[model samples]
Target: QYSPNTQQGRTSIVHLFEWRWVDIALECERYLAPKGFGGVQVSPPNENVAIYNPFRPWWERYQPVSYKLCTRSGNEDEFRNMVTRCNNVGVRIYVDAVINHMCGNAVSAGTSSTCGSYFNPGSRDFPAVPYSGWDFNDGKCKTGSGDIENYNDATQVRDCRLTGLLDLALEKDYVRSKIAEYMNHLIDIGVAGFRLDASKHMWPGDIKAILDKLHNLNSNWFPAGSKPFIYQEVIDLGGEPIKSSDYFGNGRVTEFKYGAKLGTVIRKWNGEKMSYLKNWGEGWGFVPSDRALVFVDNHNNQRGHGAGGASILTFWDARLYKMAVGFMLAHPYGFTRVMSSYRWPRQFQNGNDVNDWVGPPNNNGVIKEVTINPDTTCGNDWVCEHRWRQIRNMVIFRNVVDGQPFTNWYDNGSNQVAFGRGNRGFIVFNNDDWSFSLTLQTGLPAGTYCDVISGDKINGNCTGIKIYVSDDGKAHFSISNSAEDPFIAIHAESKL
Candidate 1:
């Protein structure tokens, strides 16, 4: 579970939020392959109940009706093509597995004809999965109506419906096999892993049972005996009755608390108090690095869906976001994932309605492709932060410094933070509104190196500002509010 099968030495995965399968395939060949990204986490690729309300939000993808691989993202054929292309290029695909429940409380068109075999709480009809009213754990749910109302009760949380969605009884062998079959299908098709959605609401034992049945990665794309990576979304914040640690034994768990801590450090205006590498670990109640999936923000939190909290960084805050992401990659920690998003107001929901409509006249209305600009920014409503020079370069830095630990940390009480990545790379950030200069410890061999964050060298001539590290491993560095970028970084392979 700890290892990622990236080409070369790449170290991060980017979630191409709501992107079509065809587009993702093109991206893997053109951008991600060249940019050192390990893989992409795509939106759920199953047939779902389309909710017209919430303006065709993305969360509607969460309400799946079947495992048909026919969502708004694309159809089954396109999905297979995407997996083949991405895996051939050494970029893995991680599917978002929504297995905890089927679509519940739907106001849209009925699936009675297609999914009549599956159980439905509203009509008590589910023929698709051959589930009837009796299959649902209604009797065990303590709530009068069988909907989960209390987070404190373990039985209610696991047995009842979440957000009005129909919950499944995993204790049933048939249920476990059905979920396993869906996952095994992906594994057989060359997908590398899965992100278990709302895993905290399900039993860990059931999750383990499902994993135990998953097929190995396709032999054509993976080495023999390579198991599909599994990372469960537990959303543990310590006091919650459901702790993330409970699921660690089965697979890696999404570490949500890291976002809060990073948000706090980045949002700091002026304080030596906002220093980097602030002893992040179990002391902060986070899962161990080996069993965690770390990211600055995710689909749910950025849109204010799960575990809403303060100091979070989104695409809206570009500068601070870059700094935080750079810090994450530069510092050794859990497996990292980059958040790629589209242009939508903070209130925009994730799904088809917003994407399916034709925009106002002269707006080019339809968002069909992701457009990259000469200035290194992405347009067409796609916020591909992974393409940003600062973020991409740090990914290279992370790959180069893989397996190396952080060393030579330096912080001055308020506005500055600096550190070295296993002696292979060095980075510094300044959030102070004023200018400052300092002679710092770089811990690098004497050389003239191009600052990857700022510029690169062309034909042996430095194109960006040059920073000289003395033979003694110290250099003079300065950053101010007026600088184009508030941070500077240099890595082992960069030329002077």
Candidate 2:
């Protein structure tokens, strides 16, 4: 469960949020492969209910109806092709497995799914998986509203419906076997692992039982008997009755607070600065490094859906968002993941109507093919952050600095800071209103290196800014408060 099964030297997975399988395959060949991204956390590939009322908001994917490999993203064949093609190019695909509950708000029955199946919302019916009322949680839910109103109560969280979705009874052997059957199918089809959605609302022992029944990853992409990587979504932000540690044995916990904390440090919201980062490991109220799957922001948080607020640093905030992402990569804290998303209609930022539920670019509710512009940016509403030079180059930076330690830390006692990844890389940021002038140990072999943030290392010469390292491995670099970019990064391999 610990091993991400990434290609050697690759250190991170980027969630190509809401990207269709065909587009994802194209990205693996055209973009992600050249950029050296380790894997892709593809959106849920299973069938979900059709949501026309909100005009097909993105959350529809979370309301799964069956295990058939069909969804707005793609059908089963496309999914198979995507998995095969991506793995062929050294990029693994991890599916967002939404197995926690059934369709929400369907007081009577479920809608027609892409997969051929009949469903009943009330009286608990799902003919595809053949689940009935007996296969769902009943007595465990102690809420008057029939939905979980208390996140502090562990039992209610695990047994009650989340926003009216029908909760599954994993304690039943039949239910566990059915869920395992779904996951095992994907495993055999070459999926590397999963992002277990609503995992916090499911029992750890039940999750383990289901995993135990899953087959080893398809040998085409993994060595025989390699277990599927699991990053269960347990959003424990402390002071909660449910703890991420409870599911540590199942797999890594999604460190929601990691992004929340990063937001604070970047924005200086809580008087935190880069100085606090010197002790970025568990001391900062985070899970153990090995047990955490970290990210700056994700699908839910960007729109303020899960565990965080507007301070979560998203693309809408542009500059600070990039800085936060850069910092996450520069520091070796935990296994990292990145989010790639479509542009939300600005109105979506406010939680209003279907207005607040805007999703990826699509015609009617069918997801359309993502078109990449010649500039390498996404067109037709997709905000492919993974394509940004700041993000992609750091993926290269992370690949090069793999297994490297942090040294030469420096902070200006405010929102300005700098650090090096062993002797391989050096990065700096000035998040304040004043200019930053620093003479610091770069921990690099003496040479001129290209600043990856401003531009690329082209033909052995910097196309942007340059940092000259003296024989003593010391360099002077500065970013003014008025400069176009407050972030500056240079690596050992970034040299002329």
Candidate 3:
């Protein structure tokens, strides 16, 4: 349950948020596999309420109508094909499983679901899953509003509805069985694992009950008896009655503090400094590295729905975002997951993006196909940050330094910092106001290495800046503050 189930030597996964199954299949063969990405965390592949009032917002996917494998992304066949194709190429697919609730109680009752499933949120009736009021937590909730109002109350947080979405009675044997059955179907389809959505709202014991019923990965793709990777979404950043550790028994928990802290430090807010990151990860009070699933930003938090509101580094802040992601990839702190998002028309009104609820790039409620330009960039408003030279190269960098230890750490009194992973990879950052120039021990063999951040290592040559390591394994580094990337990374694989 704790393992990510990535193929050997491939180290990172990218959340292809709102990407279609066909597109994901193509990405596995064309880009992700070739670029050494470990896997793709696809958006929830289940029937959900099609909210037209909000013009088909992304969050509508979270408001589940049924467990049927159909959504804007695609239907069951396409989803299965995506998983099979990705796994065949040594890439895994982790489905975002939304089993915590049904559609919001406020939503009108109808067959207005992505899969046209008949669901009446008012009566807690979902005929597709055959879930009725008995399957909901209405009787279990003690809150007056029947919705979670006080986060400090652990029982209400877990039992009451989250933002008016009907809470499921996961403690019930039937509910547990139904959720487990849905997951097992995906497993049989050859998915590596799941990202249990709204895990914070479900009891750990109930989650364990559901997981116990899950079957092993399909033997055709995974090793016999291999358990599926389970990462729960528990956004606990402290000061809450319910904690992320409460669910650690299930699997890895999303370390919200990782991004929140990294964002604050990289943005140099709250007197946070890059130099202080000399002791990152566990030292900084984050969960154990093995149990953490880290990222710079995510679908919810990037739009102020979750933590790290203004400080969260995203593709919108291209320059700083790359640097933040580079720092994360360079540092072996947690299991990294990259965020690949589409561009929404961001309209700020009184310090809020009024269009924050905007869905993926769509025409009349139908999502557009992701188009690949000649430069390998995404079209149709998709921001494929995973394909960015800096981020993509660093993803490979982490792979190269898979088992390396943090060594040769160097940092200025402030934002300038540099470090090497044993002798396999080295990375430097210049977040200071002035140019950074220094010769530091890289702990690498003497050779000319391609600075992957600026460009790629083509056939036997560097396409951009090259760093030369001397006999002593010392390399002189120079990065101007105004440089495009503001960082440089080189790995054993990039050495000539």
Candidate 4:
């Protein structure tokens, strides 16, 4: 499960959040595959509650109604087509499996589910998956509200409802089989793996049981015995009784601390600085790199819903966000996942986005098609961060530097730092108020390299700033704090 099963030389995945399956399939051929992206963390393909009170918020997708492959994204046919097309192009599709629970307990019974499945949350009934009250954890929850109120209590955290979502009795073999069946369907349809949503609320043992039932990846697309890459969303930021290590036996765990800490350092919060990142990986209290799934921000946290708070950087904070993502990609830490989001009307009331619940660009609750601009940027309010030159280039940089050791660490004792991945790639960052001017050891072979963040190397010529490395493997870099990106990255692929 630790292996992402990407094509050789591909190193990172992009979360195409709330994207339609058709658009995702198109992107696999036109953008992702050509750009060397490993795979896509697609939004949950399973059927979910259709919330209209909040005008169909994004979180509605997290509230499962059934396992049917139907949602605002598309129907089952579209989803299958997406997986097949993406796999054919050497790009994998990782489904966001919301198997931990059903719809909120407070939600009324209705046919308003994405697939028109009738469900009764109050009765713990979902006819589509055929789950009943016996399939829920309601009988076992010890909390007064039947919801998780304390993180210190390991039992309740595992058995109680997360924010009132109907907790599934995963310990039950029948329940585990149902979830496994849904996942196995996706696997047979050519999906590479899953992003197990709300994994913290499910017992590690129960998760393993379900995984045990899953078949290997579809043989046509994947190798003979490739296990589905399982990255559980176990948000352990310390103080929690359930540590990420407990679930390490299952697969890679989401390293929430990576983005939270990176955001804090980039924003210079609480006296943190780039110099402190000299020991960026496990030294900074993160899980082992191979056991981690890292990202700058996610669909949840970008709107202040998940782990990181004000410190989390998003496309709204373009300059700093780009730098943060660049640092994540350039640094050899966890298996990286880049966020691709859409724009929504943001309204702050008492420091909260009252409009944060707004869903994707929709017309009367129907999601809009992803329109691509001539510059390769997204339209219809899609904030395609993966397409950003600074980010897109660095994604390729990560691939070029894969398996290379992290080296050439340099910091100015402040907010300026630089590092290299063996001799394959090197990156520099300037977060201080002053301009950064220095001759640093890039560790690249003597040659001229294109600064990918600024522009691309086209037809053997650099459209952006060029860095000339002398025989001594040293290069002079001058990046002002006011520079648009405030970072410079060069890799073997960008070398002339």
Which 10-residue window in model 3 sums to the lowest lDDT?
304-313
Off by over 4 Å in 1: 106-121, 269-272, 347-367, 374-376, 457-462
* Candidate 4 per-residue lDDT over residues 1-496, each given as its tens digit: 9999999989999999999999999999999999999999999998999998988999999999999999999999999999999999999999999998998999999898999999998888898989999999999999999999998999999899999989999999999999999999999999888999998889999999999999998888778999999999988997878899999999999999999999999999999999999889899989998899999999989999989878999999999999999999988898999999999999999999999899999999999999999988888999999999999999999999999999999998999999999999999999999999999998899999999999899999999999999999999999999998899999999999
- Top candidate, metric lDDT: 4
Clashing pairs in 2: 109-121
RMSD (Cα, Å) of model 3: 0.8
List pairs with backbone clashes in candidate 3: none
At residue 283, what lDDT does model 3 achieve?
96
Q: Candidate 4: TM-score?
A: 0.99
The whole-model lDDT of each prediction reads 0.77, 0.86, 0.92, 0.93
Q: How do the residues 322-358 of candidate 2 rate in per-residue lDDT, one tens digit apiece? A: 8899999888999999888888666633453334478
lDDT of 1 at 469: 89
Candidate 1 accuracy as lDDT: 0.77
Off by over 4 Å in 2: 105-111, 348-354
After superposition, which runs of candidate 3 have C-alpha atoms over 4 Å from their true positions? Answer: none
What are the TM-scores, per candidate, against the unseen true structure?
0.91, 0.97, 0.99, 0.99
TM match of model 2 to true structure: 0.97
